[PDB]
Amino acid sequence: PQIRIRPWWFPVQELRDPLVFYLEAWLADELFGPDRAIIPEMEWTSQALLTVDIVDSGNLVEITVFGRPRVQNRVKSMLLCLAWFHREHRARA
């Protein structure tokens, strides 16, 4: 089992029905950074709680979103767009 804190403003009713998708480890580290200090600010602005986990192999990394389903799809699209920008940026260099 995994243990996590939850703020006092995110309701507990929304924790039902989460969303998950995987990515490259290096891309995830570049997107969030090794420290992931920005998660609280993104959460406060997006009314949505995130959770980053690293698989055992260290190759694929999972991301999570809670909140209403439309918010989930919105954040997924944003993340995939940013990931594509980073992929092409790496490809150029």
Partner: protein
Amino acid sequence: LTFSSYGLQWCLYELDKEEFQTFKELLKKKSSESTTCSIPQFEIENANVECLALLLHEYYGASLAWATSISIFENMNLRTLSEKARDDMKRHSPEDGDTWDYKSHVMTKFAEEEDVRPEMQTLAGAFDSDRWGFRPRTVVLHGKSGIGKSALARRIVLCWAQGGLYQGMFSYVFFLPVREMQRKKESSVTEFISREWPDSQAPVTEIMSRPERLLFIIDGFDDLGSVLNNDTKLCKDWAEKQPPFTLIRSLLRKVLLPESFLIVTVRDVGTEKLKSEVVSPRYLLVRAVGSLICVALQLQFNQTLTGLHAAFVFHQLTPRGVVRRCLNLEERVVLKRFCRMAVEGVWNRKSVFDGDDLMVQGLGESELRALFHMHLSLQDFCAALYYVLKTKRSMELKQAGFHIHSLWMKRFLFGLVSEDVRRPLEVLLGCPVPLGVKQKLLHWVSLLGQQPNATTPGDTLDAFHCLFETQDKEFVRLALNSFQEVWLPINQNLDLIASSFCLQHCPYLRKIRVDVKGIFPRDESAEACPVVPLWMRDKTLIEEQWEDFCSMLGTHPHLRQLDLGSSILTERAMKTLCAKLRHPTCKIQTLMFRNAQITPGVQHLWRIVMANRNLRSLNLGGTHLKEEDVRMACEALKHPKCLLESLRLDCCGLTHACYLKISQILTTSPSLKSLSLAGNKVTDQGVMPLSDALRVSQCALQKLILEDCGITATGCQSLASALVSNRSLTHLCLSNNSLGNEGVNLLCRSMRLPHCSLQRLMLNQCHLDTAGCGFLALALMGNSWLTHLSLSMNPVEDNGVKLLCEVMREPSCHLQDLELVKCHLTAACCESLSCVISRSRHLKSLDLTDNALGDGGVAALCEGLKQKNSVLARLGLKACGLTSDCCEALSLALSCNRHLTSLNLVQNNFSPKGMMKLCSAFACPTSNLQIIGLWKWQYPVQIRKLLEEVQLLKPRVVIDGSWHSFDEDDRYWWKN
């Protein structure tokens, strides 16, 4: 980089579609003026909000992009979003002996109690400090039911005893189980401390020496919330003796031993109930459904999970080693007892049963063990089974009425009337099982269907989910029959599946709209996803399911109208949708795409209009059309087989050549009998070609709309020549244009001839004046074809209305409808109009809104309508500033009149006496008003019940505050 862009996108995702386009235009202008950094225009036009923000950052720069966006926001007159952007930038942009014996005894006790019946790192920090600066005393834990809370607590206390956790903070650990405290009706803190020790005596002075040394680990707070329902005074002193629940409450509230610190383990409902007491806590989250489903699958009805659960349960219930054996009567009785126990557990929101309750039920332990093998899902299914096979009013009803955890029970309940799941039960039991539930369920859904308003989107979606669970064709056909039109958002793939299944069996469907977003798979290019396999990237199941939904849409027999309230369609999506509409079997008349965003695939829309024969209408809007697209539209219209009878282009931003092509197709195409161009920049150079097309005698146009075209006098004279030459057109609307007196005069001159065949013309916001009204009145004399007119939102004073009344007072005029709003009217115009109403014999409507008519004006119109000759049908009053005396006079007139049917009164101040008068007048048998405009809830209860009483007599009367109800469709469909 990404951190700031995220906030910027969230800033630009509050912008409406038109606001988004305006922002893009302003940005394009700024970039064109700029030479330091150039941004391509096609990329700007093709980009969406996320792409827009990312590119704006990429070219300009973080701080500079924020500044530019703030400046443009200010230019658009958007203040609040600007402040939000500034603050989020500020927050996003980076700067530039006895104790040993006690613990050993406790460890033996907990080892014995656990024998009878990773996270350490996080638990160790549960009392540390965060970045804000804070040290928590109370920590609440919650999560799914799989984990054993007592297991966590005992493991934590065991690790504490080992010394690897909180070694330096506290030395005494106390475990308070609620069950034991409830066993004893009377207790005290000193009693518990003495009991926990083996010798039964402890030094009270040493224990109470310091607060830090202590700690309390409550468990299972939710078990007895029934006792906690009682309310009692809290005890300040700790030496007193009180019921256990009061002690627990006062210790949680921190009114007793404030310096000490707590920790609690609880279930979701428990943290719903206890959140109101704990002060400034630090909640946490904890996380056998997968194991249970895997076991059931390995121990094998794939359409639904209710089927799988029923199959597994019936497999368990079958006698071991014997197949197809009817249950004995005692077996059935014990099954019913077990199911009743489970149902009581669900209703009372308790998942724990002590042996005492089991004895009260009476079922044996061995039989119960044989009947069950492994959970909330099982309890819910058992409650469903009970339904298949106390005080007068209790709070457990409303408590379970939150429908936060009873959703599974109802989902299962609907799943058992399926015959494929019913038959195994019948053979296993061997006896018939009549059930009155089906009647109630059918009546429930049918009651949903009968609602006067279009069904709420969420209610409709959940109804689709449940019905799809049922999986019975005749059941769905009987249930869905009630309603006609539906409103159905689509958020998830399972939503698509439910929508596809549940609509094939609706026999009376006419209209439907779908708001689709986020379902369309990421493009294979530029959105490659390592997690998704090859199948997901291309030829995904979502593609097949959307195609099947499209096929169902195409093949419906009674479907006519389709609409898209909002959507982000991909080119592949629109291609797939159009593919299923080229089939001749389709019968849809109307379409709509005004609010959607379908620009990439607009070209695909023309093939269907060229091919399909039953298509009658087509509505576009807000899209962007290129020259090639308009040429394709012309060619498609040029096919001899088309029967399209309406088109509507809007804000497409066309070019002069586009107007030329449109004029040519108008003169050549015989089918097209309408056209609308609102928001296009159609200058006089765009008016002349259309007039030249109109001049020819073959033109088959009958309607025409031109909004915000900004034409001038030259366009007016072009239209005048065309109208004198033409003999086919009937409806024309020129609103929001700065024609002026000269344009009014030119059109009037063209219209004075007796061969003109115009029937409806409206000129709004045209900057008219007294002179224009004089010209129109002059050209109105000696005409009998024009039947409607409207001059709204122009400063036509009393004198202009006086001239129009003088012209209309004649018996030869044939004007029927006349509306004029915001014209700065007064009482004198009211005297003239009362004369007209009393005398005239063809006027059938009138409107006077936002005019300070006042008591004198209403009195004059009342003296007019008192007459028995008048044939006025509907009258419009609003925001005219009325009072009591005028309402009395109006009530008397309505009592006298017999032809007036419609009416309207809102935005006025009626006194209660006046409202009494009005209801009494509406009561009279003589008057027959089939519509009245009023707000019921705006009045005291006395008035509401009075108006309801009036509503009871004459059940045909309708009292709805929002007018435009029961109004003909043409009046508002023509104008747009």
